[PDB]
């Protein structure tokens, strides 16, 4: 169909512009903030987010060329493992860093005394590397349960395989379905519900406090807050919703395939999530006046 062909071609250009914008913005942010001004907790968070997004978009063309040919992976097993692990770690870390920046801003607004006294650089590094540990923990199934699988037709797709762990087709299928359900539940809860609740509450309390105490001398702060919240929602909610719908109905998809709309709907939602990842440097870092001044002076 003409519409389906467009629906498949569009994610390619979406990830292409995503890769270009993400690499450019993350490189500029790293070079400016991480090398040409003093270290700050907000600066540390910005560098963490920029590094996560840059490492994600660095491996983006591999995913682009993989989905350009119906999810076939032209490269080897080791490269597929490395790219998938890096992408998953970077995505989880980026979402956790968004949540952490929301929490840090909420702490700085609600309790400025604690931020003035108990918010230091070393503590910031420890509590900023903690989310990376959480991302690695959540990526551990990708570390273990991912291998390259070649279909009899000759095409290769490096997806989750369970022949070694199970040893019995019924047991292998049961382990596969239960691990996939657990992964989907973990993604939905920790990946989406945990940060989105944090981001909505943290930015909501900042808006509530700034309105009550009357620091709103212009519409720009409210516009920035609503832009952050709306971008994060409209980008991640479709992807997590599609993933949850696929996981809850995964038995039907694997056995019969009643809900085939999810298979073709994953790609645009993943494209939009990647677009969120690439626009994060513009939405979070470029808003500040000091960074813009440093960039134009550069």
């Amino acid at each position: 169909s003409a519409g389906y062909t467009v629906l498949r071609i569009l994610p390619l250009v979406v990830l292409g512009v995503t890769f270009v914008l993400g690499v450019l913005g993350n490189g500029l942010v790293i070079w400016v903030a991480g090398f040409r001004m003093t270290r700050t907790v907000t600066t540390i968070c910005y560098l963490n987010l920029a590094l996560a997004d840059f490492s994600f978009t660095a491996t983006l063309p591999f995913l682009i060329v993989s989905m350009a040919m119906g999810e076939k992976w032209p490269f080897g097993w080791f490269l597929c493992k490395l790219i998938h692990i890096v992408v998953d770690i970077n995505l989880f870390g980026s979402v956790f860093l968004i949540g952490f920046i929301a929490l840090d801003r909420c702490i700085c607004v609600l309790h400025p005394v604690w931020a003035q006294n108990h918010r230091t650089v070393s503590l910031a590094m420890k509590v900023i590397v903690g989310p990376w540990i959480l991302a690695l923990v959540l990526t551990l199934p990708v570390f273990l349960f991912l291998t390259t699988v070649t279909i009899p037709n000759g095409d290769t797709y490096c997806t989750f395989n369970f022949a070694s762990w199970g040893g019995t087709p019924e047991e292998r299928l049961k382990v596969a379905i239960t691990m996939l359900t657990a992964r989907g539940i973990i993604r939905f809860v920790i990946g989406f519900l945990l940060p989105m609740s944090i981001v909505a509450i943290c930015y909501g309390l900042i808006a509530a406090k700034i309105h009550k105490k009357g620091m709103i001398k212009s519409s720009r702060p409210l516009r920035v807050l609503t832009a952050v919240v709306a971008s994060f929602f409209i980008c991640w909610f479709p992807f997590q919703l599609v993933a949850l719908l696929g996981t809850v109905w995964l038995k039907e998809m694997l056995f019969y395939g009643k809900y085939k709309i999810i298979d073709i709907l994953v790609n645009p939602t993943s494209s939009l999530a990647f677009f969120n990842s690439c626009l994060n440097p513009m939405l979070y870092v470029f808003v500040g006046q000091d960074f813009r001044e440093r960039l134009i002076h550069s």
């Binding site: 998938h84 995505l91 989880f92 997806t159 996939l180 994953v266």
Partner: peptide, 5 residues
């Protein structure tokens, strides 16, 4: 994160 089946 990625929905890989």
């Amino acid at each position: 994160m990625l929905f890989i089946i």
